[PDB]
Amino acid sequence: MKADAVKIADGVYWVGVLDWDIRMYHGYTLNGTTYNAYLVFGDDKVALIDNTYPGTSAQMWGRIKDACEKEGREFKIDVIVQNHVEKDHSGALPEIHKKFPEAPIYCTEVAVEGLVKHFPSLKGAPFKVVKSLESIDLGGKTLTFLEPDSMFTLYAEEGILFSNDAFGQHLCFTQRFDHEIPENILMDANQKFYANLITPLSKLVLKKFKEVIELGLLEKIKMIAPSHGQIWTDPMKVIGAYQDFATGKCKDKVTIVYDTMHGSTQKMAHAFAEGIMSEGVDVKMYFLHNDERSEIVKDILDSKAFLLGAPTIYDEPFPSVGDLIYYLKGLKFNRTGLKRLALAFGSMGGNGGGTKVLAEKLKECGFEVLDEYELYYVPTEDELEKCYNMGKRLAVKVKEMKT
Amino acid sequence: MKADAVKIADGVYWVGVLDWDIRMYHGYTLNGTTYNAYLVFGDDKVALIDNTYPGTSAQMWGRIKDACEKEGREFKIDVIVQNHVEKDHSGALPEIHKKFPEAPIYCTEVAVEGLVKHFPSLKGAPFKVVKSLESIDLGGKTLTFLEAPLLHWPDSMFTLYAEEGILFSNDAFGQHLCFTQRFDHEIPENILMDANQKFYANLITPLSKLVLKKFKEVIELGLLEKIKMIAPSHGQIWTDPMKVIGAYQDFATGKCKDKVTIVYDTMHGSTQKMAHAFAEGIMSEGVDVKMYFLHNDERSEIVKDILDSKAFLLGAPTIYDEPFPSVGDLIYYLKGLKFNRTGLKRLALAFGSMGGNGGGTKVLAEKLKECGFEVLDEYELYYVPTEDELEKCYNMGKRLAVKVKEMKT
Amino acid sequence: MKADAVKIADGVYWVGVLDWDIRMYHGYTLNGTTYNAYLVFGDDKVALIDNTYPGTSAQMWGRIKDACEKEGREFKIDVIVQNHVEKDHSGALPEIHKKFPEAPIYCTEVAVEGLVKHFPSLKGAPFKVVKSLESIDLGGKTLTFLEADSMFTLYAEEGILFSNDAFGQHLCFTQRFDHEIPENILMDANQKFYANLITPLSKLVLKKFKEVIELGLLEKIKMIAPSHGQIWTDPMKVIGAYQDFATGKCKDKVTIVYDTMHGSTQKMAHAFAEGIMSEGVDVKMYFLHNDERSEIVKDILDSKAFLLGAPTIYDEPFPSVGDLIYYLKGLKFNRTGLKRLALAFGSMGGNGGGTKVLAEKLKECGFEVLDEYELYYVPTEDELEKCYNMGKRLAVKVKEMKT
Amino acid sequence: MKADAVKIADGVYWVGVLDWDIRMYHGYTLNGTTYNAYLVFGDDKVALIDNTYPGTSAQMWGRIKDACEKEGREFKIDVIVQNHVEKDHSGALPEIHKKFPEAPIYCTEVAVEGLVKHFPSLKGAPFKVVKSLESIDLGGKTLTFLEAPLLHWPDSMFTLYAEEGILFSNDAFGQHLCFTQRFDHEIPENILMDANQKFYANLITPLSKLVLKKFKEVIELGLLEKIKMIAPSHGQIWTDPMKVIGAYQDFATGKCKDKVTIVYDTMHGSTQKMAHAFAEGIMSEGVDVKMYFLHNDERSEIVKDILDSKAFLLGAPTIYDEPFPSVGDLIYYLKGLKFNRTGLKRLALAFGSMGGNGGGTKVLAEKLKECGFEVLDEYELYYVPTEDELEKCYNMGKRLAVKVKEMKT
Numbered sequence A: 001m002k003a004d005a006v007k008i009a010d011g012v013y014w015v016g017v018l019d020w021d022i023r024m025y026h027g028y029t030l031n032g033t034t035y036n037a038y039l040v041f042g043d044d045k046v047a048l049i050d051n052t053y054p055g056t057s058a059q060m061w062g063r064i065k066d067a068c069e070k071e072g073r074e075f076k077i078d079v080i081v082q083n084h085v086e087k088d089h090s091g092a093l094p095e096i097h098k099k100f101p102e103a104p105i106y107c108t109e110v111a112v113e114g115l116v117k118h119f120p121s122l123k124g125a126p127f128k129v130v131k132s133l134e135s136i137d138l139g140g141k142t143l144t145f146l147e148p149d150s151m152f153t154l155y156a157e158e159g160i161l162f163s164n165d166a167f168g169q170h171l172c173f174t175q176r177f178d179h180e181i182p183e184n185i186l187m188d189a190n191q192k193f194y195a196n197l198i199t200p201l202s203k204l205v206l207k208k209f210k211e212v213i214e215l216g217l218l219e220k221i222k223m224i225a226p227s228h229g230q231i232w233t234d235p236m237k238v239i240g241a242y243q244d245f246a247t248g249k250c251k252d253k254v255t256i257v258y259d260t261m262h263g264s265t266q267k268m269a270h271a272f273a274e275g276i277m278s279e280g281v282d283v284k285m286y287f288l289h290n291d292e293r294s295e296i297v298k299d300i301l302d303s304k305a306f307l308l309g310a311p312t313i314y315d316e317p318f319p320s321v322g323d324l325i326y327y328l329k330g331l332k333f334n335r336t337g338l339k340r341l342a343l344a345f346g347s348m349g350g351n352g353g354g355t356k357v358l359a360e361k362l363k364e365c366g367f368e369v370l371d372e373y374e375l376y377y378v379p380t381e382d383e384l385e386k387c388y389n390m391g392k393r394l395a396v397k398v399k400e401m402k403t
Numbered sequence B, D: 001m002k003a004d005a006v007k008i009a010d011g012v013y014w015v016g017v018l019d020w021d022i023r024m025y026h027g028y029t030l031n032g033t034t035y036n037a038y039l040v041f042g043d044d045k046v047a048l049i050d051n052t053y054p055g056t057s058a059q060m061w062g063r064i065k066d067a068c069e070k071e072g073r074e075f076k077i078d079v080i081v082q083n084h085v086e087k088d089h090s091g092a093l094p095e096i097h098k099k100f101p102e103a104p105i106y107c108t109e110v111a112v113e114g115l116v117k118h119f120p121s122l123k124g125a126p127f128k129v130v131k132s133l134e135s136i137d138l139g140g141k142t143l144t145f146l147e148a149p150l151l152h153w154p155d156s157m158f159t160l161y162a163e164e165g166i167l168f169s170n171d172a173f174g175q176h177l178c179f180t181q182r183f184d185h186e187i188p189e190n191i192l193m194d195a196n197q198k199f200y201a202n203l204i205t206p207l208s209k210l211v212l213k214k215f216k217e218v219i220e221l222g223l224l225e226k227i228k229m230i231a232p233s234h235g236q237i238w239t240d241p242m243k244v245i246g247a248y249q250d251f252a253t254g255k256c257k258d259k260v261t262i263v264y265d266t267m268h269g270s271t272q273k274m275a276h277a278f279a280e281g282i283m284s285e286g287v288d289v290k291m292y293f294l295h296n297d298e299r300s301e302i303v304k305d306i307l308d309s310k311a312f313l314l315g316a317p318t319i320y321d322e323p324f325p326s327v328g329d330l331i332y333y334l335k336g337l338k339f340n341r342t343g344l345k346r347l348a349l350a351f352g353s354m355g356g357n358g359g360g361t362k363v364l365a366e367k368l369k370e371c372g373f374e375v376l377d378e379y380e381l382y383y384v385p386t387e388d389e390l391e392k393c394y395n396m397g398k399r400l401a402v403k404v405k406e407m408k409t
Numbered sequence C: 001m002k003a004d005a006v007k008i009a010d011g012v013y014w015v016g017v018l019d020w021d022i023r024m025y026h027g028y029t030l031n032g033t034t035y036n037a038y039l040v041f042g043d044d045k046v047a048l049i050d051n052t053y054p055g056t057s058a059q060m061w062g063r064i065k066d067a068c069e070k071e072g073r074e075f076k077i078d079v080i081v082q083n084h085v086e087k088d089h090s091g092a093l094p095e096i097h098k099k100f101p102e103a104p105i106y107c108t109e110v111a112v113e114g115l116v117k118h119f120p121s122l123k124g125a126p127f128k129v130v131k132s133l134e135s136i137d138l139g140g141k142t143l144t145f146l147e148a149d150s151m152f153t154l155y156a157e158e159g160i161l162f163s164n165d166a167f168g169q170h171l172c173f174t175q176r177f178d179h180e181i182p183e184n185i186l187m188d189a190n191q192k193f194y195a196n197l198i199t200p201l202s203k204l205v206l207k208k209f210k211e212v213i214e215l216g217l218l219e220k221i222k223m224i225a226p227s228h229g230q231i232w233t234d235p236m237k238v239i240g241a242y243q244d245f246a247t248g249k250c251k252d253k254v255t256i257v258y259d260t261m262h263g264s265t266q267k268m269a270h271a272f273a274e275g276i277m278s279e280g281v282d283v284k285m286y287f288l289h290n291d292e293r294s295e296i297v298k299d300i301l302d303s304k305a306f307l308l309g310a311p312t313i314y315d316e317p318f319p320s321v322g323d324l325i326y327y328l329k330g331l332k333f334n335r336t337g338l339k340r341l342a343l344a345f346g347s348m349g350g351n352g353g354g355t356k357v358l359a360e361k362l363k364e365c366g367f368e369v370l371d372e373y374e375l376y377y378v379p380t381e382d383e384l385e386k387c388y389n390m391g392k393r394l395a396v397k398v399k400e401m402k403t
């Protein structure tokens, strides 16, 4: 396939893949994504950093051949860098190794095991295990590798950090850089990526950033080139966002999620929202029947409170909540340093109990559950006024919470 | 709307609603359903048994008018029977009460409170509370009301038209089917019995001990033989009531097939490969397999197949120390259904792929035990299975299938 | 239901409905919408302008009650204004007329017929037919009705135009005004609304705007309060956007749409995109298997070219294209004054013919069809280079077209 | 992957793939399917008949190895048969040729060009072009290749194992079903025949005149009686070949039921009300109705029901002078299927609601005529139907149903 490479610096090209048509990846919704791969042309050696998903290499090979032609160089890769084992970035490694079998493959020790388990044809390939802070000279360009299957690669002379999934966003535009798309789209996508993939590592993000700041390594980063989405020409913008998300900096905002069979829990959810809105607090409303866990958690990330509602069905809450609860148990939002507030609610026709389960699970997920409200069938006008008042009292507590 | 009634016995008509276009109801998938309502014409009085979902009464009113015209009777309803409070059978009650405000409403004591909570305009309506058992005479036809026959729902009743032995069972013995044909014998048996199995699996499973208790009582009392037809609130009318009663007895006592239901989810395909390998092992022993992929399959079809399966396998990869979250929906649903209430603890295996510390399979095993399954083993592997690891899945599936065949029915 | 009204001016409130959970309306996808209704308090009479979808009045009644309480007025509506017959804005009229049966209903002559056909209980209601430029005095506030079944209502003293669907956007936020949400979200939603609902009326928008500019009506508009979405505190921003869309002002951009059974048409679509991108022209890629007609036409609206691809199935193009083609026949993009460029493409296994149908239908929809390309089964490397070259030549022509 | 082969006759095995988790294929909905591949062991040579979709060969290789082991034979393929080029049956050919590069590949002349276009690594493979009625001897078993039997696809052929009368028919007589059971008689007849009807409706309808021509040729010549089993490329194997042959004859000649298929779309619900009212009229005459809502129903199920319906109703509201656009997808699909090729011009009515000038119903009538239907009438109304307008829909449906019952197929 003929496909053009994009120059990102002198002798450095993006040779990635535009996955235009994918709509979901591991339960994360998106309007396409990219698998970013990079080609560094030293005076003596050409290095390929990461690659692409199995079966999607046609674009990558076209861009590699285009870059080599633009550089007046033969079609040859001398060094292969594999920053991560996951197949969205290593899926073409068996093809690359077959075409260039003498090119050493630089990766971590655990990555050698993971890559051969994925791709048995790589058994006996020339792996060069990196045990951190190792560097190689390409001829006027230095690549420093920093580590368990993942690592970052720094092109030292220009300060380009090949950060793999860190600082990535699932976006698929013809534009390659952060500044070429609307800021709201970029930052919303970055927020979704942090919420779904970085939240449980929040304490690690804080610990690592202080080390990097105190050592003086932050100032050596001029560009961040991740494995998905846009390339950051303003690295402090994404670093700042990660710091805010890792420390629990939230808006005066509440995320409400519910499911319903006959509509009563929906009426309650809307009534809680009216109470919250009466205090000038923002609301995001999600209906589990047709909304996505990945968008929900994006909004929980900068919300100070989270309401979850569902009716009772055979003594349990409506089962769609179990998917979100399992996902929240994995994400561990309390790792951000904040225990967001919460309320559990729902309608019932007999013994009830679903709201009691929701309250217990919200506490297990790290939320500070303030109250529960379960009612019988269709809410009366007075019961909807109770939902409003509860939402109003919650919204006052939200505004009093610092940062 | 002009719509014809269907005669089901002398002076008894179906006047229900064909909900042609609904595809899902409380998370239960279906290709339309019906809201079955019935008109019983006595010599002196007419009774309407149940009605329909809010906003769907146009067909019902057309059929009621047609039935009156076929009977040579005035357009009048004397008695309103509510066998349940849920809006799929009581949604038109405010309209019926407004048209016929002196027609008493027969229902249970709790149903009065539930009906007024749904529909405040019914405050002050002429409710007639049925306590345990009560009969009324329509003139040559007797309706006997039986309060909370499965005990669990105090808002429900069965109504028996005694002289012809027609049991108006409400949701009991119902199936979510929408055909122009009204009777059990007018559609393919597999469609009818598959729909009945799905209805039991999703709605009756946790009440299995009560179904058996109620059946033993009815058989020892001699009431079973008075039932000549079962006219439920959804789907087909049973002209062969022992066929559905027999099926309910089998499902309530845990009579299963030499069959395994496998459910999994996957991000990169490794758990899928494992699931297929377990199936190959099971199939090598002549045991049936149903395979479900949680990415796009439905909880309501899954539990239909668990109901007559002797084993259940659940697989998912690990994502941040937990199993892939789609399993949580099915696990919450199984916790509600309580399959152990059938008297059988179906066998189970938990499996999955991992990239680091793993742990998702140990969570699946704990949850399967909480849902009442007898978890025999767990198998978690690293990334893509090797040929030998797929052979271990096959062997595990083969050993499970031998155990499934040795389990007595 | 307890729900607060929002003051938009002295004695003027938004008393609408937040339809939080709707995801589709007449085949138009959205993340909820609103049904905006307005309450105007004259010194002598109170007027309700529009209302809401059947079964969604709970919020509206709560906000009306709240507004009357904030004003120190009794719960009473003296005048009812119905700017449109469609049920998303007239669905509560039977309830409003039942509560206030002596309140006249102001609407156009055709609207009386359509409202009684929807709601037979309104037979005998006190309708007051409007012909155009009719005014009513509420006591210190004047409402001027403009017939344009639909009409605009102007609150003359403050220059507030109640424009019904004109200038609307399908958005559901707690924030009510244009300036309170990200500009990209507002303008993308406005673009989608124009593309799906105003495109075929483009010649009328330009005729009306010229009439309104030549006269002194435009400067009397200080705020545009539509029936969906945000209220425009900057009315020239949306009027300007409507002018651009009605005159065919496009970007150097191409929208590519395709469907595929085995993946060959997808490969072709991606190869055309690579050619287009080599010339610095933007690409939006849609896959009909799971993408939406309403998003597709949003992007066609500011694209200078449109590529449509599909394989042949029993001598016809893959049937999903028929839905988009029927929709484009209704929208009439040539009414913007521009015949956007187009190419038809696809793969076949025998006699083919699907691309010839696509090319004929694109011409019927008003596109300037430049070429067609149909190939046999999987494209070879040379055939993908042909797609690239065709896309490259199209992109040169796109850049030469005067905006 | 370890996976067992299934013996279907002496030295003949199914070695196919269970695609458990697929839900859609080229716009055709299904609950999984299979890619049926077969191994014929003669005394001296083994032949593989078709294979599977790219990336799904793991099961196939396991079953091939298993069948060899069951026969006490080495793991070797001597002859490769490609009854079609399409990748669901040729996707593993590059792997099979790489493992057994001297095994000739029997296929049609066009098929060589199509296979090399899909798979360039097959350039220089040992293709053996078939011209029809050609046979090969495997040692006590004979395979007879029949070029383009349905005529329309020059890439296809049928293979007959002459001694046992097993016809490997590729997609002809196939069904998209995925069960552990392999034969027609091991599953409910309604599931099998409904799946067969769906397969004919979506894939064979436009070839109906060729089906009749081919069958007439086969019957006068007497080759019909040499067919003891039909082993297609998807779904169940026919141990009762006259059952599927009979069904194909009925579908190819336009034998229909007293049945009407109604399809509609709606924005505000008025067209839905009309559709339901037409159905009530039809049902009053004892004629069957299938109702489809284009918002969430599938073209492949719709055309299944059109195939044995004597009439077809299509409704949609007007949106900017055109019918609601979802109808365009169904119309494009019907233009391809050419139901008039069955020899019957099914009756039709176009209907819809409008808010201004209308015109959508006139477009629907023109398109229905282009698709080969006999359009009897059109009915377009303003906004919400009144009770009298719904009575008109009922009466129109009643008159259509009387005409449906008078039609002799």
Ligand SMILES: Cc1cc2nc3c(=O)[nH]c(=O)nc-3n(C[C@H](O)[C@H](O)[C@H](O)COP(=O)(O)O)c2cc1C
Residues within 6 Å of the ligand: A259, A260, A261, A262, A263, A264, A265, A266, A310, A311, A312, A313, A314, A315, A316, A347, A348, A349, A350, A351, A352, A353, A376, A377, A378, B026, B203
């Ligand atoms: C299938 C099903 C099972 C139910 N099981 C229970 C139950 O175990 N306990 C209970 O209190 N209510 C049960 N209900 C009643 C609902 O909880 C009740 O209708 C509630 O008002 C529904 O709220 P919703 O309108 O938000 O769906 C059940 C309802 C359905 C349809």
Ligand SMILES: Cc1cc2nc3c(=O)[nH]c(=O)nc-3n(C[C@H](O)[C@H](O)[C@H](O)COP(=O)(O)O)c2cc1C
Residues within 6 Å of the ligand: A026, A197, B265, B266, B267, B268, B269, B270, B271, B272, B316, B317, B318, B319, B320, B321, B322, B353, B354, B355, B356, B357, B358, B359, B382, B383, B384
């Ligand atoms: C977002 C994400 C989070 C993950 N978290 C973990 C983890 O916490 N522990 C672990 O062992 N593996 C983890 N993995 C790796 C997967 O479990 C691993 O890739 C596995 O092989 C996937 O199985 P599958 O192919 O069935 O999806 C994670 C993978 C992803 C994409």
Ligand SMILES: Cc1cc2nc3c(=O)[nH]c(=O)nc-3n(C[C@H](O)[C@H](O)[C@H](O)COP(=O)(O)O)c2cc1C
Residues within 6 Å of the ligand: C259, C260, C261, C262, C263, C264, C265, C266, C310, C311, C312, C313, C314, C315, C316, C347, C348, C349, C350, C351, C352, C353, C376, C377, C378, D026, D203
């Ligand atoms: C159900 C079906 C019907 C087909 N009909 C035709 C046809 O009428 N004419 C033709 O030339 N090819 C036909 N083909 C072959 C396809 O056009 C061919 O595979 C094409 O390359 C598919 O493109 P895609 O890979 O983009 O789906 C048909 C294929 C299928 C599966």
Ligand SMILES: Cc1cc2nc3c(=O)[nH]c(=O)nc-3n(C[C@H](O)[C@H](O)[C@H](O)COP(=O)(O)O)c2cc1C
Residues within 6 Å of the ligand: C026, C197, D265, D266, D267, D268, D269, D270, D271, D272, D316, D317, D318, D319, D320, D321, D322, D353, D354, D355, D356, D357, D358, D359, D382, D383, D384
């Ligand atoms: C976006 C849109 C465009 C419309 N365009 C037209 C039109 O061009 N001509 C017309 O007669 N009616 C038009 N209508 C009105 C519908 O045809 C009318 O509301 C009809 O009653 C809808 O029927 P349904 O309820 O079955 O959707 C339009 C409606 C909408 C929402």
Ligand SMILES: [Ca+2]
Residues within 6 Å of the ligand: A010, A011
């Ligand atoms: Ca340079």
Ligand SMILES: [Ca+2]
Residues within 6 Å of the ligand: A020, A021, A022, A023, A031, A032, C285, C286, C287, C290, C291
């Ligand atoms: Ca897309």
Ligand SMILES: [Ca+2]
Residues within 6 Å of the ligand: A113
């Ligand atoms: Ca290890």
Ligand SMILES: [Ca+2]
Residues within 6 Å of the ligand: B020, B021, B022, B023, B031, B032, D291, D292, D293, D296, D297
């Ligand atoms: Ca349907």
Ligand SMILES: [Ca+2]
Residues within 6 Å of the ligand: B044, B045
């Ligand atoms: Ca009487």
Ligand SMILES: [Ca+2]
Residues within 6 Å of the ligand: B217
């Ligand atoms: Ca008892």
Ligand SMILES: [Ca+2]
Residues within 6 Å of the ligand: B320, B321, B357
């Ligand atoms: Ca851990």
Ligand SMILES: [Ca+2]
Residues within 6 Å of the ligand: B362, B365, B378
């Ligand atoms: Ca254990």
Ligand SMILES: [Ca+2]
Residues within 6 Å of the ligand: A285, A286, A287, A290, A291, C020, C021, C022, C023, C031, C032
């Ligand atoms: Ca939503």
Ligand SMILES: [Ca+2]
Residues within 6 Å of the ligand: C113
């Ligand atoms: Ca008129």
Ligand SMILES: [Ca+2]
Residues within 6 Å of the ligand: B291, B292, B293, B296, B297, D020, D021, D022, D023, D031, D032
């Ligand atoms: Ca499935």
Ligand SMILES: [Ca+2]
Residues within 6 Å of the ligand: D043, D044, D045
């Ligand atoms: Ca031999």
